[PDB]
Each structure stands twice: as structure tokens, then as C-alpha cells.
Design a protein around this ligand. Structure first.
Ligand SMILES: Nc1ncnc2c1ncn2[C@@H]1O[C@H](COP(=O)(O)OP(=O)(O)O)[C@@H](O)[C@H]1O
Ligand SMILES: Nc1ncnc2c1ncn2[C@@H]1O[C@H](COP(=O)(O)OP(=O)(O)O)[C@@H](O)[C@H]1O
Lengths: 516, 177, 177
């Protein structure tokens, strides 16, 4: 029989064979073409579909693994190194089943493609199923045969599709997820004995390799967190966004749109114009959307009769993507007294901000500082602390200068930075107040960032990568940082920090000396 | 389709209908023969990005259809709304006429929403208010002017902006979007 | 089938009230119509009832030397916790029956509270279940829902009983603060 040769080709376990011949004899009491017939038919079809002993040979070779990983993806050297470390450890240990890998990072960085690359590198069969608020177990384990809705489930469907007992299962968006089912799926004590509802017979998921992806770890349940090894995938700088778009995004999208190179083109200049103008993220998702848009409109052009071959140069680009957004640029090419260039680490990425001060009433009684910008409680505290330190610094350095302690000032910090690292602009605020009090503008091309305490100690900040990227992009020659961020600044790259005179400081007095 | 309970219809029953790979064998309970819905163009509509279950929300391609500017609304009202409302209320173009001027004023002071439904309501209201006069015998014809429009659509819902032929020392004109 | 439920109780020590409930539900199942809603309800109920370890206890290590060695082997320091576990074992040995306590470990993160809990379970030969009360804010997650409602799953202590298949399970409640 068809089912007989099916089970004859592959190594069936004994209990499974007993149950399948039992149900086959139960159909032998023919009940032709009914509910209780088609139920048995579907049951036996799933049973003879599931692979039982047959598996795919693996390849734990570091050389081929490295070749595959460098071929399928650009950049991501540290993630590739972590993957190679996992592969070497799994070759040593031999099991390759200990701890679950989980990649997290901003959206659009391609942490879902690393799973396909890993499947290729391990010569396993890939399969993906997402968990966004499933709230049910019927996706994993399935339903009973009694219900009119009778489905085995994601795992059995994966097995039937891969025809392999040891495939790779990616689990997408864990942080968006029902979880106890994942526990039973991942715990090696019960993976070896997995019970589908539509298949009362158990299954062995012990040689199955699970990967996970997520956007942030804080919302993943701590039970899972104890069972996952987190890998951080960072965003891409523009120089590598260009490479990704040239080698992967544009060919993939041109294939998606049914075009080819001889008809639709995209030059490096228009691609980098896209990257810098119409996208301000750390991934390549919006860039991929823009490239798909360009290619779809080009396909429409070449069909409509006109423009047998279309070319997208940076001059006719508004015909495709629209008007340039994110065009606004540096606000001050020569800053007046009282304006300072700080660096901010916003959500989308780095940015450069112009902290501004201005007298507001003509010049006993104490002066006053009012602060604008959508500031929170912590940021108002930071502004007060910076104000007081600047007052004291002036009353110590120029004791005759009366500006701070008697005048009425207005401070404005632009509203770009996240709620965290808002206090990162403390040195910028202090320098703005000092530059206003004295008559001197700040050094010409100078950007700064770092926290300031009540006594002037320069305290560390985060997002040094984004901040220096934005600082270089804004055409800054001299950058100032706290002294505890030497590691963060020196361990990022060499093509980002080349023409950038960096000064690391611990107290504010030396910031003052190098800014005036 | 908010939630899925006892054999939830919202998502589980529809995803296999909107999934590109599944539907090619669509299993219906009655007529138990898996049918292919491959060559089938699915267009879904909604008015909120969310409140769509993610397993579908990622299967489709959200296209946004934003509202209309005043001149778009005027073109719509003249191409479609006024002719159709005439065809319904049975009033000819001569027995009552709506100039582009009065339509622009109606849009500017009464219909500042995103869709055309309130505008169609106002046009129908004007036309039926005039039809009532035509039938009651008074004013065997009707002309709607920007002065007597309050007699047809009531007092405006928004406030009118002032106008200065010579600006005093306090005021400045400015352009808003 | 009633057979599986009747058999899963042959290896238990079932109290009289639980047996009364199981019997009336089995008669109800016999009288009900298969693959109906009420049948699914009663089936789930009998499943949860007969998958409770009703008279099963795991046999504990009461040897002080071996327990002390197993404790000193997995963790450094923690003399308060280790003395408390040793006194627990001594008191459980001075009697025959099994003992039940409620302890709370507090301290900075990363000092080994959960790990020493797992090591205590190993030393005592009890099972080990852990659930989090980290941010949970519905009492049903502990007490369970009625059988009437559609979801209707029993609590989390009932789930840990069904899992550990014993009545000495060493439950760990993380983040009670
Ligand atoms: N370094 C890279 N090399 C090649 N492609 C990349 C790279 N980073 C991202 N991509 C592209 O991004 C897309 C996947 O985005 P992904 O990171 O999976 O988003 P998410 O993490 O939200 O699932 C793929 O089409 C992939 O080609
Ligand atoms: N005294 C100790 N001896 C041995 N290992 C320890 C000790 N304290 C902590 N650890 C190790 O620290 C790791 C993390 O501790 P953990 O139990 O997660 O802390 P928490 O109390 O926050 O749960 C454990 O794997 C454990 O091995």
C-alpha cells in the first residue's frame, strides 16, 4: 500500500508501527467516505508523513561555517564571531543542544536572516514560525481529533515539511508573546518525549536546534531568559548600509518585482541619498521599503510603454520616492555667544543639538533660570545642578563677573534625546551658561557630551557610537567626552574616529580650558 | 473581529484563507475537497492599524488612505456628490443651483473632517430644504447664495476668522498649513 | 474513555470526596453525547482530577552527612540557608512524616538564591517547580477560573502538582516583593 511503502522506506519506531497498523485495521472495518473515515484518513496521512528515523547530516566545520556566514551576510563581525564560538563549543561538547541562542536588537537589522544563514552553515533544514500574542497552545501541540478543527500544529508541520528529524526551528518575536508551551518545547527533559494532541503518539525533539529572536529582552519572561543566551545585534552605519543595499537589498527587490539589471538600475549615489535622506534608522527596513517603491514604480514605467530602460539618478529621484525628508541640517555654522553644540543619543540614533541661552530681563535679588524643552523631572534636576555649578564656577574663576547670580536667563535644550541620557547634556548646559556670561563664543567646531555633578566631575554617558557618528556627520572636528568612555570610543572602529580630535576629561575645569 | 474563543473565526479561520501557501489547498468542512484560491486578489479594509491580529497584520500590506484637502473635496462634490444628490431628491439643475463658490464656503465652514460623508449630508440637506419650498409652492425656483446659506445649513459649526484691510500695530498676517 | 480515568487512579490514594466527585463526573460522561461542548467540559475536568498526585510522596534524603555534603558541594557560604536546611532535615528525621515550611530568601540579585533553592531540592530529593509572581496582577493565575468559562485552567499550584507528580515539590515563588 502507499502508506505501507511510506513506512517501509524510513525507520519507524515500534509503538508508532503498532498504533498505525491498529488504526489501519480500525479502518479495515470500512466506514467508507464519512466523518469517521476521513478522520482516520487524515490521521494516517499525517502519520506516514512524519519522518521517523531519517535525519539530515550536520556540518560543524568552522571553515565552511565561516564561508557561509560571510557569504550570506555583510558586516556583523561580532555576531559572526559569536556564532563561530557557539559552533566550536557545540563541536567540542558534541551535543549542540545545551542553551538556546537569542538575537536581539533594533528592528530591521536582519536577526531573522541569521537563522537561515545558520541553517545553511549547519546543513540543517530551516523552518520559522512566529509567536506574536498567540495565547494558545493549539499552535504548538495542536487540537484533538474530536474537534471539526483538527490540526497537528506548528512542530509536526515543520517535521512534515523538512522531512528531517533534526531541523532548525527559528522562533520569531519571543518578546511579543502560551509560554509554558515554549518551556515544554525547549526543555531537553521533555523534548525527547513531545506529545501532539492530534497525534496521541509521542515525538522526539531532542536533536532539534531552536533559535530565538526578539526586539528587546526586558519583556521576555525571566523563565525563558534563564534558558536563552542573548546575542546583541547592533545597527549599521551608512557606509555598510550602502554595501547591504548594493549586494542584497536591490538584487532581492529587483527579483521581487520581476525585473533584471538590464532594465532597472540604482547607482551608489542615489542609494546613499536614500540612506541619508529618506531613512534615519539603524536597520535597513525603511531602506528596503524605499528600494521596493523605486523598483515598483520603475516596473510600472517600463510597462506603460515609455522608458524601455529606466535609470534612477539623484536628480529624477523625487519622481520615485517623493520629496526629501530629514533634510534639516546644522543650525549654526559659526555659533554666537551662548550657543553650544552637544551630542544626543535619540531613539532613531545619534543627533547634534544646539543648546541655547538668552538674557530675558534687563540688568538684593537673585537671578533666575527658566528652561524650555519637553523636560522631565530628572532633566529639570540636571538643569538645576548644572546651573548651580556654573554659578559657582564663575564666582570662583571671575569673582567680579556678576552675570549668573543676578541676571534672568532662558535656557533651551532641544527635544531630541531619550528620557534616559537626558542628563548627558550637563556639560553643554554649563558651557552655554558660561559662554553667555562671558562675552566669548565657544571654540569653532566643537561638540560635547557628558554628565556634570554639583562639584564639576564629568560623569560617563551612553551611546558614544551614535553620538560620534552624528558628530562626524555634522562636520565637527573636535569632540569632548568623559574619561570613563575611553573604552567605548576606542573600541568602535577606525573609519569612524579618524579625523576627529577627541578629548577625554574628568572634571569640568579642563573642559573649560579646552573650550575657551 | 476582536477575539477568538470557541473555535475563533477572527484569525485561525482566516489566515489560511489569506496565507499565500496555505490557501492553494483550502479545506471547507462541507464539500470536503481542498480547493485552490491562488488566483484570487484579496483586498481588506480597516480604519485602525492595530486591532488586526498580528498573524494577518504581517501577511497584508497596509496602504494608507488619508483624508481630502478642501479643493479635493470641492472636486468630489462637483463631480459626484451634487449630481447624485440631485438624481435622488429629484431636483433638476435649474430649479436649484449650487455654485462652486457656495460649495467652497460650505466645505470651509461646515465640513472640515477627512471624508466626504458629512459633505454629502450637507448637500442633501440644502437640496431637500429647497425641494420643500418648490413643493410647498413658495419660491418656484431657489438660488443658494453665500449670504442665505445659514438658512439651509444652520449656523456654522466653526468660528470665522477676522479680516483686516489695514492691520493695526498689533496684528501680523501669517500662513498656516 | 472511562477506562483511562479509572486506571490512572489505581496508583493513587484518593480521598473519599475526590472519589465522589470523580464518580459523579464519570456517570455524567457516560450519559453525555460525545464530542459535544458539555462532554469536552467534563472530559477536561476528569483529566485534571485524575492527573493530580493524590497520595504520592517522594522519599527524602534524611542523612545529615550526605545532605551537608551535597549542600557544601554546590554553593560557597550561605551558612544561614544551610543551617536552616540541616535543621529542617533533623526535625523531619525526629518524626516520620514529611514536613512543610515557608521560607523567604532576600538579598541583592546574583547571589544564588534560586540556585541554592535548586540545590536544596537536590539534597532533599524532592521535585522542583518554580513560577513567578513578578508582575502578575490577576488572582485567577493562582486560584483558577470556574469550569463555566471558556479558558478555564486551574491556577498554578494545581499545574505544579500535575507536573511534579508528587506532593513534596519544593515550590519556588520568585519576586514576591
Ligand atoms: N548585514 C546584512 N546583510 C544582508 N542583509 C541584511 C543585513 N542586515 C539586514 N539585512 C536584510 O534585512 C532583512 C531582514 O530584517 P530583520 O533584521 O530580519 O528584521 P527583524 O529583525 O525585525 O525581523 C532581510 O531582507 C535581510 O536581507
Ligand atoms: N555562593 C555561591 N557559590 C556558588 N555559586 C554561586 C554563589 N552565589 C551565586 N552563585 C552563582 O551565581 C549564578 C546566578 O545566581 P542566581 O541564582 O541567578 O541569583 P539570584 O539570587 O538573583 O537568582 C548561579 O548560577 C550560581 O551558580
Amino acid at each position: 500500500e502507499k502508506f505501507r511503502e511510506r513506512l517501509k522506506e524510513l525507520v519507524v519506531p515500534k509503538h508508532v508501527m503498532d498504533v498505525v497498523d491498529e488504526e489501519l485495521s480500525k479502518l479495515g472495518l470500512l466506514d467508507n467516505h464519512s466523518s469517521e473515515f476521513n478522520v482516520t484518513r487524515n490521521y494516517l496521512d499525517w502519520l506516514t508523513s512524519i519522518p521517523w528515523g531519517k535525519y539530515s547530516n550536520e556540518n560543524l566545520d568552522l571553515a565552511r561555517a565561516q564561508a557561509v556566514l560571510e557569504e550570506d551576510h555583510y558586516g556583523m563581525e561580532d555576531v559572526k564571531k559569536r556564532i563561530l564560538e557557539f559552533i566550536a563549543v557545540s563541536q567540542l561538547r558534541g551535543s549542540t543542544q545545551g542553551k538556546i541562542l537569542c538575537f536581539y536588537g533594533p528592528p530591521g537589522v536582519g536577526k531573522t536572516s541569521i537563522a537561515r544563514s545558520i541553517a545553511r552553515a549547519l546543513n540543517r533544514e530551516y523552518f520559522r514560525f512566529s509567536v506574536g500574542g498567540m495565547t494558545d497552545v493549539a499552535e504548538i501541540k495542536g487540537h484533538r481529533r474530536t474537534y471539526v478543527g483538527a490540526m497537528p500544529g506548528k512542530i509536526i508541520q515543520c517535521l512534515k515539511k523538512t522531512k528531517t528529524e533534526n531541523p532548525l526551528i527559528l522562533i520569531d518575536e519571543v518578546d511579543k508573546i502560551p509560554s509554558s508551551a515554549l518551556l515544554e518545547l525547549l526543555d531537553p527533559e521533555q523534548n525527547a518525549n513531545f506529545l501532539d494532541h492530534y497525534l496521541d503518539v509521542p515525538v522526539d525533539l531532542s536533536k532539534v536546534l531552536f533559535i530565538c529572536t526578539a526586539n528587546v529582552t526586558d519583556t521576555i519572561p525571566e523563565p525563558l531568559r534563564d534558558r536563552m543566551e542573548m546575542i546583541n545585534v547592533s545597527g549599521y552605519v551608512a557606509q555598510e548600509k550602502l554595501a547591504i543595499a548594493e549586494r542584497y537589498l536591490v538584487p532581492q527587490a529587483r527579483a521581487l518585482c520581476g525585473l533584471d539589471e538590464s532594465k532597472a538600475k540604482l547607482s551608489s549615489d542615489v542609494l546613499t541619498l536614500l540612506i541619508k535622506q529618506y531613512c534615519r534608522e539603524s536597520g535597513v527596513r525603511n531602506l528596503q521599503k524605499q528600494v521596493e517603491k523605486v523598483l515598483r514604480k520603475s516596473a510600472y514605467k517600463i510597462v506603460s510603454g515609455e522608458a524601455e530602460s529606466v535609470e534612477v539618478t539623484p536628480e529624477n529621484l523625487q519622481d520615485f520616492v517623493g520629496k526629501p525628508v530629514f533634510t534639516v541640517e546644522r543650525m549654526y555654522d559659526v555659533t554666537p555667544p551662548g550657543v553650544v553644540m552637544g551630542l544626543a543619543w535619540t531613539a532613531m540614533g545619534g543627533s547634534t543639538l544646539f543648546v541655547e541661552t538668552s538674557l530675558r530681563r534687563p540688568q538684593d535679588k537673585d537671578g533666575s533660570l527658566e528652561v524650555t524643552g519637553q523636560l522631565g523631572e530628572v532633566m529639570k534636576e540636571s538643569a538645576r545642578i548644572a546651573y548651580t555649578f556654573a554659578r559657582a564656577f564663575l564666582m570662583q574663576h571671575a569673582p567680579a563677573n556678576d552675570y549668573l547670580v543676578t541676571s534672568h536667563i532662558h535656557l533651551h535644550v532641544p527635544e531630541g534625546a531619550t528620557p534616559k541620557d537626558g542628563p548627558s547634556a550637563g556639560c553643554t548646559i554649563v558651557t552655554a551658561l558660561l559662554s553667555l556670561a562671558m562675552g566669548r563664543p565657544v571654540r569653532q567646531n566643537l561638540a560635547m557630551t557628558g554628565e556634570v555633578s554639583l562639584t564639576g566631575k564629568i560623569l560617563p554617558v551612553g551611546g558614544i557610537k551614535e553620538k560620534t557618528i552624528a558628530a562626524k556627520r555634522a562636520g565637527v572636528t573636535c569632540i569632548v567626552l568623559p574619561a570613563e568612555n575611553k573604552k567605548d570610543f576606542y573600541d568602535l572602529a577606525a573609519f569612524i574616529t579618524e579625523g576627529l580630535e577627541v578629548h577625554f576629561v574628568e572634571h569640568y575645569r579642563e573642559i573649560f580650558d579646552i573650550a575657551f | 473581529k476582536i477575539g477568538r474563543g470557541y473555535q475563533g473565526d477572527p484569525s485561525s479561520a482566516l489566515l489560511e484563507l489569506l496565507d499565500p501557501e496555505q490557501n492553494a489547498n483550502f479545506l471547507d468542512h462541507y464539500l470536503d475537497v481542498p480547493v485552490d484560491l491562488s488566483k484570487v486578489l484579496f483586498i481588506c479594509t480597516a480604519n485602525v492599524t492595530d486591532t488586526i491580529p498580528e498573524p494577518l497584520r504581517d501577511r497584508m500590506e497596509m496602504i494608507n488612505v488619508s483624508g481630502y484637502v478642501a479643493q479635493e473635496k470641492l472636486a468630489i462634490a462637483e463631480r459626484y456628490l451634487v449630481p447624485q444628490a440631485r438624481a435622488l431628491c429629484g431636483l433638476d439643475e435649474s430649479k436649484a443651483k449650487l455654485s462652486s463658490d457656495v460649495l467652497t464656503l460650505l466645505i470651509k465652514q461646515y465640513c472640515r473632517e477627512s471624508g466626504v460623508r458629512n459633505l454629502q449630508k450637507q448637500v442633501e440637506k440644502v437640496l431637500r430644504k429647497s425641494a420643500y419650498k418648490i413643493v410647498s409652492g413658495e419660491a418656484e425656483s431657489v438660488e443658494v447664495t453665500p449670504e442665505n446659506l445659514q438658512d439651509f445649513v444652520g449656523k456654522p459649526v466653526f468660528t470665522v476668522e477676522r479680516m483686516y484691510d489695514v492691520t493695526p500695530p498689533g496684528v501680523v498676517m501669517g500662513l498656516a498649513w | 474513555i472511562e477506562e483511562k480515568f479509572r486506571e490512572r487512579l489505581k496508583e493513587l490514594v484518593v480521598p473519599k470526596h475526590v472519589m465522589d466527585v470523580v464518580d459523579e463526573e464519570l456517570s455524567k460522561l457516560g450519559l453525555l453525547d460525545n464530542h459535544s461542548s458539555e462532554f469536552n467540559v467534563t472530559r477536561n475536568y476528569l483529566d485534571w482530577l485524575t492527573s493530580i498526585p493524590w497520595g504520592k510522596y517522594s522519599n527524602e534524603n534524611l542523612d545529615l552527612a550526605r545532605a551537608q555534603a551535597v549542600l557544601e558541594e554546590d554553593h560557597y557560604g550561605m551558612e544561614d540557608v544551610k543551617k536552616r536546611i540541616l535543621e529542617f532535615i533533623a526535625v523531619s528525621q525526629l518524626r516520620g512524616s514529611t514536613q512543610g515550611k515557608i521560607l523567604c530568601f532576600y538579598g541583592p540579585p546574583g547571589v544564588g538564591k534560586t540556585s541554592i533553592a535548586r540545590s536544596i531540592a537536590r539534597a532533599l530529593n524532592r521535585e522542583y517547580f518554580r513560577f513567578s509572581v513578578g508582575g502578575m496582577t490577576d488572582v485567577a493565575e493562582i486560584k483558577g477560573h470556574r469550569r463555566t468559562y471558556v479558558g478555564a485552567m486551574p491556577g498554578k499550584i494545581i499545574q505544579c502538582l500535575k507536573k511534579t507528580k508528587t506532593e513534596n515539590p519544593l515550590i519556588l515563588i520568585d519576586e514576591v516583593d
